[PDB]
PDB file of C-alpha atoms and ligand atoms in Angstrom:
ATOM      1  CA  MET A   1      84.679  93.100 120.680  1.00  0.00           C
ATOM      2  CA  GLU A   2      88.342  91.990 119.487  1.00  0.00           C
ATOM      3  CA  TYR A   3      88.920  88.236 119.396  1.00  0.00           C
ATOM      4  CA  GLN A   4      91.487  85.945 117.815  1.00  0.00           C
ATOM      5  CA  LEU A   5      90.472  82.859 115.764  1.00  0.00           C
ATOM      6  CA  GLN A   6      92.564  79.889 117.094  1.00  0.00           C
ATOM      7  CA  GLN A   7      92.522  76.241 116.675  1.00  0.00           C
ATOM      8  CA  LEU A   8      93.900  73.329 118.974  1.00  0.00           C
ATOM      9  CA  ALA A   9      94.485  69.648 118.465  1.00  0.00           C
ATOM     10  CA  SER A  10      93.226  67.287 120.841  1.00  0.00           C
ATOM     11  CA  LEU A  11      94.933  67.532 124.018  1.00  0.00           C
ATOM     12  CA  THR A  12      95.665  65.592 127.589  1.00  0.00           C
ATOM     13  CA  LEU A  13      94.956  67.729 130.490  1.00  0.00           C
ATOM     14  CA  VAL A  14      95.782  66.843 134.045  1.00  0.00           C
ATOM     15  CA  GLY A  15      94.251  68.380 136.917  1.00  0.00           C
ATOM     16  CA  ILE A  16      91.347  68.288 139.331  1.00  0.00           C
ATOM     17  CA  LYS A  17      87.887  68.731 138.407  1.00  0.00           C
ATOM     18  CA  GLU A  18      84.996  69.751 141.039  1.00  0.00           C
ATOM     19  CA  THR A  19      81.214  69.728 140.311  1.00  0.00           C
ATOM     20  CA  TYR A  20      78.917  72.189 141.653  1.00  0.00           C
ATOM     21  CA  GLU A  21      75.094  72.049 141.536  1.00  0.00           C
ATOM     22  CA  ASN A  22      74.439  75.832 140.063  1.00  0.00           C
ATOM     23  CA  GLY A  23      77.194  77.167 137.892  1.00  0.00           C
ATOM     24  CA  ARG A  24      75.474  80.456 139.077  1.00  0.00           C
ATOM     25  CA  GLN A  25      77.086  81.275 142.504  1.00  0.00           C
ATOM     26  CA  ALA A  26      79.656  78.867 141.881  1.00  0.00           C
ATOM     27  CA  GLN A  27      81.825  81.605 141.280  1.00  0.00           C
ATOM     28  CA  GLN A  28      82.358  81.515 145.069  1.00  0.00           C
ATOM     29  CA  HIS A  29      83.282  78.033 145.152  1.00  0.00           C
ATOM     30  CA  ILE A  30      85.371  78.496 142.187  1.00  0.00           C
ATOM     31  CA  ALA A  31      87.543  81.131 144.233  1.00  0.00           C
ATOM     32  CA  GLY A  32      87.578  78.559 147.191  1.00  0.00           C
ATOM     33  CA  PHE A  33      88.507  75.791 144.839  1.00  0.00           C
ATOM     34  CA  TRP A  34      91.433  77.922 143.610  1.00  0.00           C
ATOM     35  CA  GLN A  35      92.375  78.929 147.232  1.00  0.00           C
ATOM     36  CA  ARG A  36      92.510  75.013 148.050  1.00  0.00           C
ATOM     37  CA  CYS A  37      94.575  74.280 144.882  1.00  0.00           C
ATOM     38  CA  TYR A  38      97.045  76.464 146.045  1.00  0.00           C
ATOM     39  CA  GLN A  39      97.186  76.233 149.480  1.00  0.00           C
ATOM     40  CA  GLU A  40      97.543  72.019 149.317  1.00  0.00           C
ATOM     41  CA  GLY A  41     100.238  72.387 146.595  1.00  0.00           C
ATOM     42  CA  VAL A  42      98.165  71.203 143.607  1.00  0.00           C
ATOM     43  CA  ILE A  43      98.909  74.307 141.426  1.00  0.00           C
ATOM     44  CA  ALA A  44     102.627  73.997 142.303  1.00  0.00           C
ATOM     45  CA  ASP A  45     102.742  70.106 141.481  1.00  0.00           C
ATOM     46  CA  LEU A  46     100.613  70.779 138.108  1.00  0.00           C
ATOM     47  CA  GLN A  47     102.940  73.139 137.040  1.00  0.00           C
ATOM     48  CA  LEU A  48     105.747  70.679 137.040  1.00  0.00           C
ATOM     49  CA  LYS A  49     103.674  68.713 134.594  1.00  0.00           C
ATOM     50  CA  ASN A  50     102.854  71.729 132.198  1.00  0.00           C
ATOM     51  CA  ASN A  51     104.328  70.408 128.823  1.00  0.00           C
ATOM     52  CA  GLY A  52     103.497  74.015 127.082  1.00  0.00           C
ATOM     53  CA  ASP A  53     100.946  72.676 124.780  1.00  0.00           C
ATOM     54  CA  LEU A  54      99.183  75.582 126.011  1.00  0.00           C
ATOM     55  CA  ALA A  55     101.563  77.762 127.960  1.00  0.00           C
ATOM     56  CA  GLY A  56      99.689  78.333 131.504  1.00  0.00           C
ATOM     57  CA  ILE A  57      97.228  77.187 133.925  1.00  0.00           C
ATOM     58  CA  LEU A  58      93.644  76.377 132.623  1.00  0.00           C
ATOM     59  CA  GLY A  59      90.484  76.855 134.445  1.00  0.00           C
ATOM     60  CA  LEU A  60      87.967  74.951 132.471  1.00  0.00           C
ATOM     61  CA  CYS A  61      83.983  75.168 132.572  1.00  0.00           C
ATOM     62  CA  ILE A  62      82.747  71.843 131.765  1.00  0.00           C
ATOM     63  CA  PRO A  63      78.823  71.031 131.162  1.00  0.00           C
ATOM     64  CA  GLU A  64      77.681  68.169 132.798  1.00  0.00           C
ATOM     65  CA  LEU A  65      74.679  66.091 131.183  1.00  0.00           C
ATOM     66  CA  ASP A  66      72.761  66.261 134.486  1.00  0.00           C
ATOM     67  CA  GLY A  67      72.614  70.119 134.311  1.00  0.00           C
ATOM     68  CA  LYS A  68      75.219  70.557 136.791  1.00  0.00           C
ATOM     69  CA  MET A  69      78.734  72.698 136.260  1.00  0.00           C
ATOM     70  CA  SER A  70      82.229  71.329 136.825  1.00  0.00           C
ATOM     71  CA  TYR A  71      85.148  73.496 136.974  1.00  0.00           C
ATOM     72  CA  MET A  72      88.782  72.012 136.457  1.00  0.00           C
ATOM     73  CA  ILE A  73      91.934  73.506 137.082  1.00  0.00           C
ATOM     74  CA  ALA A  74      94.297  72.028 134.825  1.00  0.00           C
ATOM     75  CA  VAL A  75      97.372  71.829 132.815  1.00  0.00           C
ATOM     76  CA  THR A  76      98.283  70.367 129.386  1.00  0.00           C
ATOM     77  CA  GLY A  77     100.484  67.247 130.051  1.00  0.00           C
ATOM     78  CA  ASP A  78     101.978  64.118 128.480  1.00  0.00           C
ATOM     79  CA  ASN A  79      99.447  61.463 129.139  1.00  0.00           C
ATOM     80  CA  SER A  80     101.803  59.405 131.282  1.00  0.00           C
ATOM     81  CA  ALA A  81     100.693  57.680 134.540  1.00  0.00           C
ATOM     82  CA  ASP A  82      98.972  60.668 136.591  1.00  0.00           C
ATOM     83  CA  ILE A  83      95.266  58.907 137.049  1.00  0.00           C
ATOM     84  CA  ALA A  84      96.466  57.695 140.249  1.00  0.00           C
ATOM     85  CA  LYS A  85      96.197  61.208 141.773  1.00  0.00           C
ATOM     86  CA  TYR A  86      94.806  63.623 139.251  1.00  0.00           C
ATOM     87  CA  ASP A  87      91.819  63.847 136.913  1.00  0.00           C
ATOM     88  CA  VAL A  88      92.610  63.343 133.223  1.00  0.00           C
ATOM     89  CA  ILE A  89      90.632  64.772 130.485  1.00  0.00           C
ATOM     90  CA  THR A  90      90.823  64.831 126.686  1.00  0.00           C
ATOM     91  CA  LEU A  91      90.078  68.010 125.375  1.00  0.00           C
ATOM     92  CA  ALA A  92      88.636  67.449 121.857  1.00  0.00           C
ATOM     93  CA  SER A  93      90.093  69.346 119.207  1.00  0.00           C
ATOM     94  CA  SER A  94      88.125  72.770 118.555  1.00  0.00           C
ATOM     95  CA  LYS A  95      88.374  76.240 116.837  1.00  0.00           C
ATOM     96  CA  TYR A  96      88.053  78.765 119.541  1.00  0.00           C
ATOM     97  CA  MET A  97      87.103  82.804 119.638  1.00  0.00           C
ATOM     98  CA  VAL A  98      89.767  83.687 121.846  1.00  0.00           C
ATOM     99  CA  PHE A  99      89.237  86.838 124.182  1.00  0.00           C
ATOM    100  CA  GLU A 100      91.845  88.779 126.613  1.00  0.00           C
ATOM    101  CA  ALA A 101      90.829  90.185 129.735  1.00  0.00           C
ATOM    102  CA  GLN A 102      93.653  92.535 130.817  1.00  0.00           C
ATOM    103  CA  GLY A 103      93.864  93.553 134.769  1.00  0.00           C
ATOM    104  CA  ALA A 104      94.025  92.326 138.033  1.00  0.00           C
ATOM    105  CA  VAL A 105      92.524  88.616 138.510  1.00  0.00           C
ATOM    106  CA  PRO A 106      89.582  87.782 139.173  1.00  0.00           C
ATOM    107  CA  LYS A 107      87.667  90.989 138.725  1.00  0.00           C
ATOM    108  CA  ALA A 108      89.192  91.632 135.143  1.00  0.00           C
ATOM    109  CA  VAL A 109      88.333  88.189 134.133  1.00  0.00           C
ATOM    110  CA  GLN A 110      84.699  88.274 135.408  1.00  0.00           C
ATOM    111  CA  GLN A 111      83.960  91.782 133.790  1.00  0.00           C
ATOM    112  CA  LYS A 112      85.484  90.196 130.604  1.00  0.00           C
ATOM    113  CA  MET A 113      83.358  87.004 130.829  1.00  0.00           C
ATOM    114  CA  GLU A 114      80.150  89.109 131.082  1.00  0.00           C
ATOM    115  CA  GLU A 115      81.064  90.993 127.922  1.00  0.00           C
ATOM    116  CA  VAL A 116      81.962  87.805 126.224  1.00  0.00           C
ATOM    117  CA  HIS A 117      78.812  86.621 127.254  1.00  0.00           C
ATOM    118  CA  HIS A 118      76.708  89.331 125.962  1.00  0.00           C
ATOM    119  CA  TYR A 119      78.696  89.239 122.757  1.00  0.00           C
ATOM    120  CA  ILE A 120      78.492  85.536 121.735  1.00  0.00           C
ATOM    121  CA  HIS A 121      74.520  85.876 122.278  1.00  0.00           C
ATOM    122  CA  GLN A 122      74.578  87.112 118.516  1.00  0.00           C
ATOM    123  CA  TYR A 123      76.520  83.475 117.555  1.00  0.00           C
ATOM    124  CA  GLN A 124      74.096  81.058 118.896  1.00  0.00           C
ATOM    125  CA  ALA A 125      74.432  78.317 115.976  1.00  0.00           C
ATOM    126  CA  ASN A 126      78.372  78.874 115.887  1.00  0.00           C
ATOM    127  CA  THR A 127      79.055  78.273 119.890  1.00  0.00           C
ATOM    128  CA  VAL A 128      79.029  75.080 121.375  1.00  0.00           C
ATOM    129  CA  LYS A 129      77.366  74.582 124.540  1.00  0.00           C
ATOM    130  CA  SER A 130      78.403  71.082 125.089  1.00  0.00           C
ATOM    131  CA  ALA A 131      82.106  71.690 124.710  1.00  0.00           C
ATOM    132  CA  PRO A 132      84.386  72.957 127.280  1.00  0.00           C
ATOM    133  CA  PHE A 133      85.358  76.681 127.549  1.00  0.00           C
ATOM    134  CA  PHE A 134      88.161  77.965 129.741  1.00  0.00           C
ATOM    135  CA  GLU A 135      90.440  80.621 131.328  1.00  0.00           C
ATOM    136  CA  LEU A 136      94.210  80.480 130.539  1.00  0.00           C
ATOM    137  CA  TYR A 137      96.587  82.024 133.154  1.00  0.00           C
ATOM    138  CA  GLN A 138     100.047  82.153 131.527  1.00  0.00           C
ATOM    139  CA  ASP A 139     103.084  83.438 133.484  1.00  0.00           C
ATOM    140  CA  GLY A 140     103.085  86.712 134.914  1.00  0.00           C
ATOM    141  CA  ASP A 141     101.758  88.783 137.927  1.00  0.00           C
ATOM    142  CA  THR A 142      97.930  88.297 138.446  1.00  0.00           C
ATOM    143  CA  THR A 143      97.897  91.362 140.513  1.00  0.00           C
ATOM    144  CA  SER A 144      99.085  93.525 137.903  1.00  0.00           C
ATOM    145  CA  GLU A 145      96.702  96.051 136.126  1.00  0.00           C
ATOM    146  CA  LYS A 146      98.612  94.832 132.784  1.00  0.00           C
ATOM    147  CA  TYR A 147      98.232  91.012 133.475  1.00  0.00           C
ATOM    148  CA  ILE A 148      96.271  89.247 130.688  1.00  0.00           C
ATOM    149  CA  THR A 149      94.029  86.343 130.964  1.00  0.00           C
ATOM    150  CA  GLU A 150      92.797  84.669 127.629  1.00  0.00           C
ATOM    151  CA  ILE A 151      89.178  83.351 127.639  1.00  0.00           C
ATOM    152  CA  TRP A 152      88.768  80.447 125.113  1.00  0.00           C
ATOM    153  CA  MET A 153      85.356  79.862 123.467  1.00  0.00           C
ATOM    154  CA  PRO A 154      84.763  76.918 121.131  1.00  0.00           C
ATOM    155  CA  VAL A 155      83.380  77.682 117.841  1.00  0.00           C
ATOM    156  CA  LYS A 156      81.752  75.913 115.133  1.00  0.00           C
ATOM    157  CA  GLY A 157      80.962  77.081 111.438  1.00  0.00           C
ATOM    158  CA  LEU A 158      81.730  80.628 112.397  1.00  0.00           C
ATOM    159  CA  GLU A 159      82.813  81.579 108.625  1.00  0.00           C
ATOM    160  CA  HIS A 160      79.070  81.127 107.691  1.00  0.00           C
ATOM    161  CA  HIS A 161      77.949  83.564 110.078  1.00  0.00           C
ATOM    162  CA  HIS A 162      76.516  86.684 108.054  1.00  0.00           C
ATOM    163  CA  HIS A 163      78.685  89.246 109.959  1.00  0.00           C
ATOM    164  CA  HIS A 164      81.647  87.782 108.097  1.00  0.00           C
ATOM    165  CA  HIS A 165      80.032  88.291 104.442  1.00  0.00           C
TER     166      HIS A 165
HETATM  167  C1  RHQ B 201      98.119  81.575 137.765  1.00  0.00           C
HETATM  168  C2  RHQ B 201      96.533  81.726 138.072  1.00  0.00           C
HETATM  169  N1  RHQ B 201      96.417  82.333 139.179  1.00  0.00           N
HETATM  170  C3  RHQ B 201      95.327  82.339 140.104  1.00  0.00           C
HETATM  171  C4  RHQ B 201      94.134  82.276 139.101  1.00  0.00           C
HETATM  172  C5  RHQ B 201      92.857  82.697 139.703  1.00  0.00           C
HETATM  173  O1  RHQ B 201      91.523  82.641 139.246  1.00  0.00           O
HETATM  174  C6  RHQ B 201      90.395  82.740 139.771  1.00  0.00           C
HETATM  175  C7  RHQ B 201      89.116  82.518 138.962  1.00  0.00           C
HETATM  176  C8  RHQ B 201      87.940  83.167 139.469  1.00  0.00           C
HETATM  177  N2  RHQ B 201      86.964  82.896 138.780  1.00  0.00           N
HETATM  178  C9  RHQ B 201      86.824  82.743 137.543  1.00  0.00           C
HETATM  179  C10 RHQ B 201      87.269  84.180 136.723  1.00  0.00           C
HETATM  180  C11 RHQ B 201      88.009  83.365 140.950  1.00  0.00           C
HETATM  181  C12 RHQ B 201      86.783  83.557 141.720  1.00  0.00           C
HETATM  182  C13 RHQ B 201      89.077  83.584 141.469  1.00  0.00           C
HETATM  183  C14 RHQ B 201      90.522  83.380 141.136  1.00  0.00           C
HETATM  184  C15 RHQ B 201      91.521  83.402 141.608  1.00  0.00           C
HETATM  185  C16 RHQ B 201      91.570  83.499 143.195  1.00  0.00           C
HETATM  186  C17 RHQ B 201      90.832  82.523 143.793  1.00  0.00           C
HETATM  187  C18 RHQ B 201      90.802  82.562 145.347  1.00  0.00           C
HETATM  188  C19 RHQ B 201      91.486  83.642 146.065  1.00  0.00           C
HETATM  189  C20 RHQ B 201      92.238  84.899 145.127  1.00  0.00           C
HETATM  190  C21 RHQ B 201      92.097  84.783 143.918  1.00  0.00           C
HETATM  191  C22 RHQ B 201      92.830  85.860 143.062  1.00  0.00           C
HETATM  192  O2  RHQ B 201      92.449  86.098 141.953  1.00  0.00           O
HETATM  193  O3  RHQ B 201      94.057  86.647 144.076  1.00  0.00           O
HETATM  194  C23 RHQ B 201      94.759  87.545 143.172  1.00  0.00           C
HETATM  195  C24 RHQ B 201      95.494  86.817 142.114  1.00  0.00           C
HETATM  196  C25 RHQ B 201      92.772  83.164 141.108  1.00  0.00           C
HETATM  197  C26 RHQ B 201      94.184  83.105 141.935  1.00  0.00           C
HETATM  198  C27 RHQ B 201      95.378  82.907 141.436  1.00  0.00           C
HETATM  199  C28 RHQ B 201      96.326  83.040 142.152  1.00  0.00           C
HETATM  200  C1  P4P B 202      74.258  76.720 128.775  1.00  0.00           C
HETATM  201  C2  P4P B 202      75.460  76.962 129.207  1.00  0.00           C
HETATM  202  C3  P4P B 202      76.592  77.674 128.682  1.00  0.00           C
HETATM  203  C4  P4P B 202      76.060  78.686 127.753  1.00  0.00           C
HETATM  204  P1  P4P B 202      77.292  79.887 127.207  1.00  0.00           P
HETATM  205  C5  P4P B 202      76.510  80.811 126.078  1.00  0.00           C
HETATM  206  C6  P4P B 202      76.386  82.185 126.592  1.00  0.00           C
HETATM  207  C7  P4P B 202      75.792  83.422 125.799  1.00  0.00           C
HETATM  208  C8  P4P B 202      75.043  82.982 124.580  1.00  0.00           C
HETATM  209  C9  P4P B 202      75.201  81.533 124.344  1.00  0.00           C
HETATM  210  C10 P4P B 202      75.911  80.414 124.937  1.00  0.00           C
HETATM  211  C11 P4P B 202      78.256  80.719 128.368  1.00  0.00           C
HETATM  212  C12 P4P B 202      79.716  81.317 128.142  1.00  0.00           C
HETATM  213  C13 P4P B 202      80.005  82.016 129.251  1.00  0.00           C
HETATM  214  C14 P4P B 202      79.403  82.199 130.578  1.00  0.00           C
HETATM  215  C15 P4P B 202      78.378  81.221 130.661  1.00  0.00           C
HETATM  216  C16 P4P B 202      77.839  80.555 129.803  1.00  0.00           C
HETATM  217  C17 P4P B 202      78.620  78.924 125.990  1.00  0.00           C
HETATM  218  C18 P4P B 202      79.070  77.684 126.328  1.00  0.00           C
HETATM  219  C19 P4P B 202      80.156  76.916 125.304  1.00  0.00           C
HETATM  220  C20 P4P B 202      80.552  77.675 124.504  1.00  0.00           C
HETATM  221  C21 P4P B 202      80.235  78.922 123.910  1.00  0.00           C
HETATM  222  C22 P4P B 202      79.064  79.683 124.823  1.00  0.00           C
HETATM  223  C23 P4P B 202      75.117  78.597 127.188  1.00  0.00           C
HETATM  224  C24 P4P B 202      73.826  77.677 127.817  1.00  0.00           C
END
């Protein structure tokens, strides 16, 4: 599997986080969540705020300590008075394995997520289960077979994996 190693400083993310019981069939809920954010003008409003620290819209999967799973639609923004309407989180600095899913959204993303899932199974000491992972949707036609979604998986100590020696 191909991936790029990337590192991010700590960032401020502005958007809306919803919380789902399962994290399993949440895929249907996540679909509805995207649809609602588009319909209610939230995507458009967040786009205005995107400072380009990351060049697109994020779909973050956030683990909850009670076992629930949250999904946050967000952009990187300047920490400046958006708490009144939006959720604002700090995304703690981390290294990442960054994968590319090429094809029409969401199917290409789902298929790649499955492959990533199977792949990182061999890196249990290096992935970070408590840290958010995310989809990154940069500018483009998400219905195009050429469209690329990035999948960002946080890692620690990856250099020590015996695969790299
Ligand atoms: C700039 C990013 N723009 C978009 C990003 C999106 O990410 C999605 C992630 C998903 N899960 C995690 C992979 C699921 C299930 C649906 C998604 C849709 C989606 C949700 C509801 C209905 C249709 C779509 C959809 O994909 O319509 C075709 C584009 C989606 C749509 C747009 C428009
Ligand atoms: C609990 C919650 C999330 C993960 P995981 C993961 C998958 C495969 C092997 C190890 C870990 C994940 C990844 C993609 C989709 C669903 C779950 C995961 C979480 C954070 C960082 C790396 C991997 C694991 C346990």
